Structure formats: structure tokens, C-alpha cells
């Protein structure tokens, strides 16, 4: 076929695993997933082609927008009576002559008004990248115009006739592949499950078991007798304290061959995606030794079986009811389940506490009793759920009248419900139902790294989170682009390869034309991915890389595609001269691309990117996104702390891409230390003289107050002279993040004086440093939720809550607002010896 086979090899390249290899998968829980049940995502395509070509265009080019419509008061003061001056680079002649035009327009206007003033047949293109002003959003909402107003930059916006884009987007529609087309509450018996034997036991060995719903034990942890290692003929019908109807929906039984150190752990759902209590013999390969865990079991893991079949396999014999028993529908459960001194104040004391606050059982019973009032205060839902034992049918039934009827909570609050705890299929249903309705495309863009890692927390392959993420990826090629590259990064993990290959190929069938560009991205990456592996010492390196991009096969894949950091950055022919290799630890690729846009000179004549291959960049993105929200809740309250949360994307295993800031000058190891202690201020002064000397100092403090407290609140690592850089408008920021939660700058704030503490400018630096954590400690629930969502990300730092206790220490969440003022002051006056 010319429509089925046209796509099934492009897909095999854009995932790296042939669709044939997943056609031959014998596991019954893949074919049911891939069938038309997910292919209702074609409705997403129906959404993206509803009103052609405007709907198609808004799909293909996603606006980059700020989540804050109303411009803040200080940014409003950054404007001349709330007015921005923008240059319009009209092109009319067929030649290269450009007719520019300058306009003074109210910052609350719209691209339609810009079109009307400059002169609907035209669209505004950001001059130097394929950023397009298309939909009816205010000018100041776009990140380009908002950043222009913030930095006082001169905004550049060329005019292009719409036909130059409407006719530049060939259509590519959706063709389906060949695969297009008792009750557990009436039994009376304890949980009685047999261990047969282990096929590949490794050298009194016993199976330690237990029922878990979360990290919470659901009964006594039944064990086996101590058989000899040679012949593990267990054959034991272990009797669990858990009565079978009491088994909850997500109650994966946890095996542990234990020599009480677990030789091998493994989770197995006590249900399945069709709500069937697993029966019959089951030979499952067990997962390797727990990663940094000395627990009695390892419920911190994935359900199902191990794809690697060389691991010790244990044989099990589940319940034999001589029939099939199904978990009741939610209607039957719901039918089954069918004051101001502290009953209103203690509740608010709980709600305002972080989810990491260990709720006492004496207070868990208080939370449990006031179900009828905790429903009125929404932000307590993450804590009411933990106030319920999953040992019981009646307890969980009582909750299912609450979390199903719970009024929706704010999206950053509903993102905690998708962690390792809260593993109920309906808790995550509520979390995703809130995340769909309230989360916006740029907040989703920030939080997508979190949402990808919580696919692994839902127990079946056809989640509702999968549906949400796929539908969003089929409407913007930023959710699509970054979702695709997140999954491609997490393909190399065998644990989630089965999920993520199917998810990827579900996306590669309905993304559209972008797949080719996506392939051209992947191809362009896999040469660089190859190139780095070829590379794994500079002049030979420089000439080798020049030779390796001058070849026609290499130069073909490395030209005319889009940046994996920004598809709006239309990469053209490589600037062969300005591409080099650093003398760094992993030797990343400094790569420069000329802009095929006619007028490259406005934003940037050339596009610069760092290509790291060897270091994980999920923690780097985690730091940069925490920085982004911290800035957005500092620069929305009027505390004009200035910083740069820039682009970062890990494209595979420990391989990724970083947008170079060319404005930010050399590292301070040379820009300040010259690879004397007065170099930084002198260099900043000689590069900024006159009446402009205010901001170049004024924005330095606001660029050092917000990063001394960010490196504090999140416990970020050491700040060497090779880790910090500085712009020329006084801005500085940190670039080499990574692992965390584990004076030259002083004289600049005092404007060159060798004595700084006595100065008033140092005092204002302190008084904005304090206001920095005044609101960050007011917004701690968001940060705790975000940190908690990355526990199963595989990051070596976020393994358990014992590491998120570090941010608890740094923010001191237990103390009162007045008492927390001196908490930072102690370490702050310890760092610089007085303040
Ligand atoms: C965001 C960003 N902007 C840069 N800017 C220049 O390097 N510039 C700016 C122009 C000249 C050049 C220079 N020598 O000054 S670097 C950088 C960055 C971000 C993250 N990690 C790194 C490295 C180099 C430490 C790593 F780890 F990748 F090797 C760099």
C-alpha cells in the first residue's frame, strides 16, 4: 500500500524501533492499546482542520505566549505612558530592499492593530525566526513583546502576506494502519495466593510479599518458610490478612525474593485494564535489586512483568474462583457508600501545610471525620486522601463520593495527585481532568517534563493522561515537539520503552507534515548523536567536525530543519565557520546556523546552540523551570527581579541541547579572573558609561538578589568562576546547574567602593533579597508538588522524599512568617560575614 507503507518506515526512523517489532510483541496489552481506542485522537486532527487554513495555521505554528495577560505595574512603568515602540520591516519589492517603519502603539493592542497602523491579508513574522502573530492575543502577552518591554529592546516584526505561509504548509492527513479494526464484592474469602517456585534463583531463601496501594502496606506482609536455595519448591498458598473484596483497584501485590534484604522485587496489579482479578499460573521475571533501597519490600516501581527475560523468574498461582471476578463499576461503589474553634481553624492549618507535612494519625482521624467540611476547602484534597486507609471497601467507597464530586482545584495543586502516592485510577482521573481544563499551553510547556514522567505512574497503558498528552501534542508542535523529544529521550529505558514506543508511534501517525521535519530533526540529531560517539584535542576536533559536516550526506541532514530547542528557530544552512568544540568535560558542540529568514540581522544574524552528549539534562530543565515560575511570581507581584530561564531539551539518553546566550559575556573565570578583585565592576563600567550607568548597576542587584536566594531555596550546587556569566545591561545568571538539593559581586552593588556593608545600596540589596523569599515561601505548595512529581523520573537526586526534605530545610516551612525572616538572615550574614 502507498498509504500504509508510506508512514510505517518514517515512524520506524522517528522512534528508532520498527513498527514490525511491536507487531510481533506477544503481550496481549499492546494490540488492544494501539487499536482505534487511542486512534480517536484523529478527532484532534478533526480539531486542527476544523476551519482551514486558519485552524491549520494556528496548529502548525504555535504562538509563544506568557501566561499572564495583564501587564504588571512595574512593567507598565517600564513603558512611556504604557506604549511600546516597534519597527515594522515591510518588504515590497521583489529584490532585497526593505522598507522599515517605526510605530508607537499601546502595549495592550493586538497584531490586527499593528497591521492597521503599519499600513486582513498580512501576518507579523518575528524577524529572524518563524514566530508568528496569528491569534487574538494582546501584544504584551507574547513572550517576544513582553521581553522587549522588560528589557527595553527594540521589537522586530516583518510583514508577510498570509499566502506566503498558507501555501507554504502542504497538507498531510491521517491514514489508519492495518490494525484499525462474578463481582469481587460478593465473595467471602481471604486473599490466598500461591508461590510455586523461582526458575532462575541466584545465590533459606524466602518470598516476602505484601499488598500495597501507594507506599502504604495494605495488611500484614505475609512470608514463606525458608526453603533451600537449590530447590525453591515453595508451593505455599500464602494466606493474607487482606480480605479479597477489600483489595483496592490499584493494589499491586509486591513480590520480594529475599535472602530482609530483597534479592529481587516486583509489582503485579491485583487487577488488569479490563478490571479482572488476575487468576491462574503466572511466571513473571522479577526486577533487579532495589536502587538505593533497604526497605522490607520495593513498592516503588512499575507493575507488569520485566521485558528482560534473563532475570530471575518466579511462578505464581493467583485466586481460583472457578470464574472471572470483576471490580464493580463506580456506580455500585457510590451506591454502597450512599465547629469553629478548631473544626474550621485546624483544617486551615492543615491545608496551608506542605504535602510533605507528616500528618499524625490523631490528626488523620480528624481529617477523616470532617469529610463534609474538607470538601469546602479544596486544597486539602491531597491530605484528605492520605487520611483514609485503603484496607477497606467502605473507606475508599466513602472517598469516591468526594474526589469524584470534588470541585476542581488549581492545576499546580492538581499536579500532586499524579505522584507515586495517590495511585488510584480515579485520583489521577481527577488530577488530569483538572489539568486539561485549567492548565494553559505555556504552563503546560513548563510542566510537560513533569507530566511525561507521571505517565509511568499510571498502571495501565491506555491511561487518561496518555489521552490528554496526546491530544495536546496534536494541536501544537511545542507540546508535540517537546513531548516527542521527551519520549524519545526516555525510549532507551527498557522499563518504559513498551509504553513510550507505542505512545510515540501513536503520535507519529497524526502529527502531520512535521514528521518529515521531525525525521530531519531526528536524523540531524542522530548524526550529531553519532558524531559525538565518533568523537568519544581541539584543532583536530575542529577540522574533523568541519569535515564531518561538509560531506553531502551529513550536510543534507544538518541544514534546513528546525531547532530541537525551538521549531520557531528555522535553521538554515550551517555557518561552517562559527561551529566549534569546547574544551569542556563532555566536549559539547558549539554549532551556528545562518538564518534562512531574509532579515537575519534583527534578532540574531546567526543561531547558536550547545549540543551536550553525556550529561543528563532533566535536572537542568528542572532547575530552569523552577527559575521560570519563581521569576513569574516575583515579576508579577511588582518585585522586579530579573533573570533568564532559557531553552533546554534532553533529546535522548544524557544528550541534549542548550540555547546559547551570546549577550551573556564570557565566564567569570576569564571575564573577571582572566584565565585583582575589582575586575567585574570595572569591566561593567567601561562597557556602560553615561546616564545608562543606572540600569547596568540597577539590574545587577536585581540579577544577584534573585539568584543568591534561588541557589539557596533549592540548595543548588557550588558557583565556581566558570559557572556564572554576565550580560552588559547588568544582567547575570547561572548556567551550569544539574545536581542540587544535596567579593567581586559585592563592590558592584555598592558601585565600586571597597567598603560595601555601610552603603545604602547594600541595604536595598538585602531588602529585596528578603522580599525574594517573602513570596517564594508564600508559594511553596507549587514547588513541593513539582519536586514530588519527578521521583520516578530516574534522577539520582529525587529518589525519595528524604531528598525533597532539603528544600524543607532551606525554606524552613515549619516556622512562622516572622520567625522565618531571621532563618535566611543567619546563613546570609554567615556567607559574607555581616549584613
Ligand atoms: C546558556 C549558555 N550561553 C553561553 N554563552 C557563551 O558561551 N558565549 C556568549 C558569546 C560568546 C560565548 C562565550 N565564550 O562566552 S553558554 C551557555 C551554557 C549553558 C549550559 N551549560 C554550558 C556549558 C558550556 C558549561 C556546558 F556545560 F554545556 F559545557 C553553557
Tab-separated table of C-alpha atoms in Angstrom, residues 189-520:
chain	number	residue	atom	x	y	z
A	189	UNK	CA	-12.618	-15.341	51.287
A	190	UNK	CA	-9.267	-14.028	52.464
A	191	UNK	CA	-6.527	-13.318	49.945
A	192	UNK	CA	-4.882	-16.683	49.349
A	193	UNK	CA	-2.153	-16.636	46.697
A	194	UNK	CA	0.377	-19.378	45.975
A	195	UNK	CA	4.104	-19.143	45.362
A	196	UNK	CA	5.156	-22.060	43.150
A	197	UNK	CA	8.913	-21.569	42.705
A	198	UNK	CA	11.580	-19.350	41.161
A	199	UNK	CA	13.006	-20.532	37.851
A	200	UNK	CA	16.340	-18.664	37.896
A	201	UNK	CA	17.076	-18.107	41.584
A	202	UNK	CA	20.505	-16.616	42.291
A	203	UNK	CA	22.828	-17.424	45.183
A	204	UNK	CA	16.743	-20.192	53.479
A	205	UNK	CA	15.608	-18.082	50.533
A	206	UNK	CA	12.019	-16.938	51.038
A	207	UNK	CA	9.421	-14.837	49.236
A	208	UNK	CA	8.479	-11.725	51.191
A	209	UNK	CA	5.103	-10.468	49.974
A	210	UNK	CA	2.586	-7.759	50.803
A	211	UNK	CA	-0.363	-5.803	49.419
A	212	UNK	CA	0.235	-2.106	48.773
A	213	UNK	CA	-1.840	0.818	47.483
A	214	UNK	CA	0.796	3.528	47.154
A	215	UNK	CA	3.655	3.175	49.585
A	216	UNK	CA	1.124	2.119	52.224
A	217	UNK	CA	1.051	-1.532	53.353
A	218	UNK	CA	-2.442	-2.955	52.994
A	219	UNK	CA	-2.124	-5.814	55.510
A	220	UNK	CA	0.473	-7.859	57.320
A	221	UNK	CA	3.340	-8.717	54.982
A	222	UNK	CA	2.916	-12.468	54.678
A	223	UNK	CA	6.071	-14.518	54.116
A	224	UNK	CA	7.137	-18.014	53.090
A	225	UNK	CA	9.135	-20.584	55.004
A	226	UNK	CA	12.887	-20.807	54.451
A	227	UNK	CA	13.341	-23.420	51.727
A	228	UNK	CA	16.820	-24.399	50.474
A	229	UNK	CA	18.179	-22.222	47.685
A	230	UNK	CA	18.775	-25.195	45.372
A	231	UNK	CA	15.102	-26.250	45.142
A	232	UNK	CA	12.757	-23.316	45.807
A	233	UNK	CA	9.737	-25.639	45.715
A	234	UNK	CA	7.735	-23.110	47.734
A	235	UNK	CA	4.270	-24.253	46.607
A	236	UNK	CA	2.897	-22.209	49.512
A	237	UNK	CA	-0.679	-20.915	49.420
A	238	UNK	CA	0.125	-17.794	51.431
A	239	UNK	CA	-2.867	-16.532	53.412
A	240	UNK	CA	-3.011	-12.748	53.506
A	241	UNK	CA	-4.653	-10.748	56.256
A	242	UNK	CA	-6.366	-8.804	53.455
A	243	UNK	CA	-9.918	-9.964	52.772
A	244	UNK	CA	-10.306	-10.198	48.995
A	245	UNK	CA	-13.196	-7.725	48.464
A	246	UNK	CA	-11.135	-5.192	50.443
A	247	UNK	CA	-8.481	-5.282	47.706
A	248	UNK	CA	-8.418	-1.800	46.123
A	249	UNK	CA	-8.230	-1.118	42.412
A	250	UNK	CA	-4.531	-0.158	42.309
A	251	UNK	CA	-3.427	-2.732	44.900
A	252	UNK	CA	-0.449	-4.195	43.109
A	253	UNK	CA	0.819	-7.133	45.129
A	254	UNK	CA	4.554	-6.749	45.694
A	255	UNK	CA	6.824	-9.798	45.491
A	256	UNK	CA	10.282	-9.904	47.013
A	257	UNK	CA	12.630	-12.857	46.828
A	258	UNK	CA	14.688	-12.128	49.949
A	259	UNK	CA	17.826	-13.873	51.196
A	260	UNK	CA	15.219	-8.856	54.987
A	261	UNK	CA	17.159	-7.536	52.006
A	262	UNK	CA	15.258	-8.072	48.717
A	263	UNK	CA	17.182	-10.245	46.284
A	264	UNK	CA	14.567	-9.330	43.670
A	265	UNK	CA	11.383	-7.255	43.844
A	266	UNK	CA	8.371	-6.981	41.598
A	267	UNK	CA	4.933	-5.376	41.400
A	268	UNK	CA	1.896	-7.143	39.938
A	269	UNK	CA	-1.502	-5.480	39.665
A	270	UNK	CA	-4.215	-7.349	41.526
A	271	UNK	CA	-6.406	-6.257	38.645
A	272	UNK	CA	-5.921	-5.541	34.956
A	273	UNK	CA	-7.067	-2.979	32.424
A	274	UNK	CA	-10.370	-4.854	31.986
A	275	UNK	CA	-10.890	-4.869	35.805
A	276	UNK	CA	-10.146	-8.607	36.102
A	277	UNK	CA	-8.637	-10.051	39.269
A	278	UNK	CA	-5.690	-11.993	37.884
A	279	UNK	CA	-6.052	-15.774	38.136
A	280	UNK	CA	-4.178	-18.863	37.048
A	281	UNK	CA	-0.479	-19.579	36.831
A	282	UNK	CA	1.762	-16.593	36.073
A	283	UNK	CA	5.528	-16.793	35.519
A	284	UNK	CA	6.958	-13.282	35.868
A	285	UNK	CA	10.571	-12.168	35.578
A	286	UNK	CA	11.471	-10.071	38.598
A	287	UNK	CA	13.112	-6.655	38.542
A	288	UNK	CA	16.744	-6.164	39.649
A	289	UNK	CA	17.912	-5.325	43.177
A	290	UNK	CA	16.279	-2.168	44.598
A	291	UNK	CA	18.079	1.038	43.636
A	292	UNK	CA	19.342	2.518	46.894
A	293	UNK	CA	16.573	0.957	48.985
A	294	UNK	CA	16.927	-1.055	52.196
A	295	UNK	CA	13.169	-1.386	52.698
A	296	UNK	CA	11.241	-4.535	53.560
A	297	UNK	CA	9.777	-4.504	50.029
A	298	UNK	CA	10.080	-2.301	46.934
A	299	UNK	CA	6.626	-0.909	46.112
A	300	UNK	CA	8.482	1.986	44.452
A	301	UNK	CA	8.472	0.590	40.942
A	302	UNK	CA	6.436	-0.425	37.931
A	303	UNK	CA	3.672	-3.008	37.616
A	304	UNK	CA	3.580	-5.688	34.939
A	305	UNK	CA	6.443	-8.001	34.048
A	306	UNK	CA	10.102	-7.379	33.260
A	307	UNK	CA	10.715	-7.105	29.488
A	308	UNK	CA	14.204	-8.528	30.060
A	309	UNK	CA	13.694	-12.292	30.272
A	310	UNK	CA	17.165	-13.208	31.592
A	311	UNK	CA	16.251	-12.080	35.126
A	312	UNK	CA	15.091	-14.498	37.871
A	313	UNK	CA	11.532	-15.563	37.046
A	314	UNK	CA	9.103	-16.533	39.806
A	315	UNK	CA	5.975	-18.633	39.295
A	316	UNK	CA	2.739	-17.597	40.976
A	317	UNK	CA	-0.746	-19.075	41.283
A	318	UNK	CA	-3.428	-16.497	41.968
A	319	UNK	CA	-7.020	-16.928	43.101
A	320	UNK	CA	-9.014	-19.802	41.615
A	321	UNK	CA	-12.667	-18.789	41.923
A	322	UNK	CA	-13.714	-21.116	39.057
A	323	UNK	CA	-14.928	-17.984	37.231
A	324	UNK	CA	-13.887	-14.411	36.404
A	325	UNK	CA	-14.396	-11.692	39.028
A	326	UNK	CA	-14.545	-8.022	38.033
A	327	UNK	CA	-14.125	-4.859	40.077
A	328	UNK	CA	-17.531	-3.152	40.406
A	329	UNK	CA	-18.280	-0.066	38.373
A	330	UNK	CA	-18.150	3.262	40.186
A	331	UNK	CA	-21.965	3.389	40.314
A	332	UNK	CA	-22.196	0.295	42.533
A	333	UNK	CA	-19.422	1.613	44.796
A	334	UNK	CA	-21.120	5.013	45.032
A	335	UNK	CA	-24.422	3.345	45.932
A	336	UNK	CA	-22.615	1.272	48.575
A	337	UNK	CA	-21.135	4.394	50.174
A	338	UNK	CA	-24.512	6.169	49.969
A	339	UNK	CA	-17.406	23.786	64.929
A	340	UNK	CA	-15.365	26.972	64.503
A	341	UNK	CA	-12.698	26.870	67.237
A	342	UNK	CA	-10.738	24.039	65.596
A	343	UNK	CA	-13.197	22.339	63.215
A	344	UNK	CA	-12.579	25.361	60.956
A	345	UNK	CA	-9.151	26.639	62.077
A	346	UNK	CA	-7.213	23.378	62.427
A	347	UNK	CA	-8.454	22.428	58.950
A	348	UNK	CA	-6.945	25.626	57.545
A	349	UNK	CA	-3.755	24.872	59.466
A	350	UNK	CA	-3.590	21.541	57.623
A	351	UNK	CA	-4.442	22.971	54.194
A	352	UNK	CA	-1.711	25.622	54.277
A	353	UNK	CA	0.865	22.952	55.150
A	354	UNK	CA	3.004	21.305	52.506
A	355	UNK	CA	2.117	17.768	51.359
A	356	UNK	CA	5.400	16.617	52.924
A	357	UNK	CA	3.925	17.500	56.340
A	358	UNK	CA	3.652	14.111	58.062
A	359	UNK	CA	0.011	14.087	59.163
A	360	UNK	CA	-0.346	12.366	62.525
A	361	UNK	CA	-2.862	9.562	62.980
A	362	UNK	CA	-4.578	11.574	65.710
A	363	UNK	CA	-4.925	14.291	63.068
A	364	UNK	CA	-5.623	11.802	60.258
A	365	UNK	CA	-8.758	10.772	62.167
A	366	UNK	CA	-9.706	14.448	62.473
A	367	UNK	CA	-9.252	14.874	58.717
A	368	UNK	CA	-11.260	11.696	58.102
A	369	UNK	CA	-14.149	12.747	60.351
A	370	UNK	CA	-14.602	16.127	58.640
A	371	UNK	CA	-15.230	14.874	55.128
A	372	UNK	CA	-18.302	17.124	54.938
A	373	UNK	CA	-16.120	20.206	55.539
A	374	UNK	CA	-12.843	19.330	53.794
A	375	UNK	CA	-14.875	19.325	50.563
A	376	UNK	CA	-15.458	23.057	51.113
A	377	UNK	CA	-11.702	23.767	51.334
A	378	UNK	CA	-10.294	22.343	48.075
A	379	UNK	CA	-6.531	22.498	48.650
A	380	UNK	CA	-6.905	19.842	51.394
A	381	UNK	CA	-7.759	17.067	48.912
A	382	UNK	CA	-4.115	15.858	48.712
A	383	UNK	CA	-4.287	15.444	52.510
A	384	UNK	CA	-7.795	14.067	52.962
A	385	UNK	CA	-6.912	11.186	50.619
A	386	UNK	CA	-3.960	10.222	52.828
A	387	UNK	CA	-6.350	10.328	55.817
A	388	UNK	CA	-8.089	7.195	54.503
A	389	UNK	CA	-6.960	3.594	54.812
A	390	UNK	CA	-7.086	1.589	51.592
A	391	UNK	CA	-7.504	-1.567	53.692
A	392	UNK	CA	-11.257	-1.084	53.460
A	393	UNK	CA	-14.022	-1.164	50.883
A	394	UNK	CA	-16.079	1.325	52.890
A	395	UNK	CA	-13.216	3.804	53.319
A	396	UNK	CA	-12.405	4.001	49.613
A	397	UNK	CA	-16.101	3.965	48.740
A	398	UNK	CA	-16.554	6.972	51.040
A	399	UNK	CA	-13.731	8.773	49.246
A	400	UNK	CA	-15.172	8.021	45.806
A	401	UNK	CA	-18.140	10.229	46.663
A	402	UNK	CA	-15.634	13.031	47.395
A	403	UNK	CA	-12.816	13.018	44.827
A	404	UNK	CA	-15.312	12.309	42.051
A	405	UNK	CA	-17.546	15.185	43.224
A	406	UNK	CA	-14.658	17.435	44.274
A	407	UNK	CA	-14.780	20.990	42.866
A	408	UNK	CA	-11.756	21.484	40.595
A	409	UNK	CA	-8.546	22.809	42.117
A	410	UNK	CA	-5.821	24.911	40.538
A	411	UNK	CA	-3.623	22.980	38.077
A	412	UNK	CA	-0.414	23.300	40.099
A	413	UNK	CA	-2.382	21.845	43.020
A	414	UNK	CA	-3.842	19.008	40.916
A	415	UNK	CA	-0.359	18.020	39.745
A	416	UNK	CA	0.445	16.475	43.141
A	417	UNK	CA	-2.293	13.884	42.615
A	418	UNK	CA	-0.161	12.307	39.835
A	419	UNK	CA	2.753	11.227	42.039
A	420	UNK	CA	3.867	7.809	43.303
A	421	UNK	CA	1.281	8.123	46.051
A	422	UNK	CA	-2.323	8.801	45.068
A	423	UNK	CA	-2.057	5.851	42.626
A	424	UNK	CA	-5.796	5.359	42.499
A	425	UNK	CA	-7.197	5.264	38.943
A	426	UNK	CA	-9.774	7.894	39.928
A	427	UNK	CA	-7.412	10.162	41.866
A	428	UNK	CA	-5.351	10.510	38.703
A	429	UNK	CA	-8.561	10.905	36.733
A	430	UNK	CA	-9.410	13.959	38.835
A	431	UNK	CA	-5.845	15.266	38.503
A	432	UNK	CA	-5.858	15.016	34.707
A	433	UNK	CA	-9.424	16.335	34.469
A	434	UNK	CA	-8.233	19.461	36.282
A	435	UNK	CA	-5.002	19.614	34.250
A	436	UNK	CA	-6.982	19.606	30.996
A	437	UNK	CA	-9.447	22.338	31.956
A	438	UNK	CA	-7.143	24.876	33.627
A	439	UNK	CA	-3.530	24.322	32.533
A	440	UNK	CA	-2.574	26.605	29.636
A	441	UNK	CA	-0.256	25.829	26.748
A	442	UNK	CA	2.725	27.711	28.176
A	443	UNK	CA	2.164	26.427	31.702
A	444	UNK	CA	1.808	23.021	30.049
A	445	UNK	CA	5.043	23.761	28.192
A	446	UNK	CA	6.763	24.429	31.520
A	447	UNK	CA	5.231	21.382	33.232
A	448	UNK	CA	5.473	18.882	30.355
A	449	UNK	CA	8.717	17.478	31.744
A	450	UNK	CA	6.696	16.685	34.878
A	451	UNK	CA	3.680	15.270	33.038
A	452	UNK	CA	5.814	12.932	30.908
A	453	UNK	CA	7.395	11.357	33.995
A	454	UNK	CA	3.955	10.747	35.553
A	455	UNK	CA	2.821	8.578	32.649
A	456	UNK	CA	4.936	5.893	34.338
A	457	UNK	CA	2.820	6.256	37.492
A	458	UNK	CA	-0.476	5.209	35.904
A	459	UNK	CA	-0.675	1.461	35.899
A	460	UNK	CA	-2.294	0.605	32.554
A	461	UNK	CA	-1.036	1.552	29.095
A	462	UNK	CA	-4.187	3.367	27.933
A	463	UNK	CA	-4.377	5.996	30.653
A	464	UNK	CA	-6.405	9.159	30.522
A	465	UNK	CA	-3.119	11.032	30.958
A	466	UNK	CA	-1.973	9.444	27.698
A	467	UNK	CA	-5.122	10.819	26.073
A	468	UNK	CA	-4.533	14.315	27.498
A	469	UNK	CA	-0.864	14.456	26.494
A	470	UNK	CA	-1.544	13.067	23.009
A	471	UNK	CA	-4.440	15.432	22.315
A	472	UNK	CA	-2.325	18.396	23.410
A	473	UNK	CA	0.591	17.213	21.262
A	474	UNK	CA	-1.784	17.021	18.268
A	475	UNK	CA	-2.609	20.739	18.467
A	476	UNK	CA	0.773	22.464	18.977
A	477	UNK	CA	4.224	21.447	17.711
A	478	UNK	CA	5.678	22.613	21.002
A	479	UNK	CA	3.712	20.162	23.102
A	480	UNK	CA	4.186	17.865	20.118
A	481	UNK	CA	7.865	18.726	19.591
A	482	UNK	CA	8.907	18.564	23.233
A	483	UNK	CA	6.571	15.686	24.100
A	484	UNK	CA	8.065	13.733	21.202
A	485	UNK	CA	11.624	14.507	22.281
A	486	UNK	CA	10.889	13.740	25.950
A	487	UNK	CA	9.578	10.317	24.954
A	488	UNK	CA	12.491	9.818	22.542
A	489	UNK	CA	14.814	10.589	25.445
A	490	UNK	CA	13.034	8.024	27.615
A	491	UNK	CA	12.987	5.298	24.939
A	492	UNK	CA	16.389	3.952	25.994
A	493	UNK	CA	14.846	2.825	29.306
A	494	UNK	CA	13.505	-0.716	28.993
A	495	UNK	CA	11.033	-0.099	31.829
A	496	UNK	CA	9.019	2.486	29.875
A	497	UNK	CA	10.082	1.534	26.339
A	498	UNK	CA	6.926	-0.562	25.925
A	499	UNK	CA	4.754	2.428	26.903
A	500	UNK	CA	6.706	5.143	25.122
A	501	UNK	CA	7.261	3.380	21.799
A	502	UNK	CA	3.534	2.809	21.475
A	503	UNK	CA	2.847	6.395	22.549
A	504	UNK	CA	5.417	7.770	20.093
A	505	UNK	CA	4.051	5.803	17.140
A	506	UNK	CA	0.567	6.869	18.190
A	507	UNK	CA	1.849	10.434	17.786
A	508	UNK	CA	3.902	9.847	14.612
A	509	UNK	CA	0.726	8.896	12.713
A	510	UNK	CA	-1.184	12.145	13.328
A	511	UNK	CA	1.437	14.867	13.809
A	512	UNK	CA	1.281	15.515	10.064
A	513	UNK	CA	3.919	17.042	7.802
A	514	UNK	CA	6.070	17.780	10.853
A	515	UNK	CA	7.095	14.114	10.968
A	516	UNK	CA	9.372	14.713	7.984
A	517	UNK	CA	10.895	17.741	9.712
A	518	UNK	CA	10.810	15.637	12.869
A	519	UNK	CA	12.716	12.964	10.974
A	520	UNK	CA	15.008	15.700	9.693
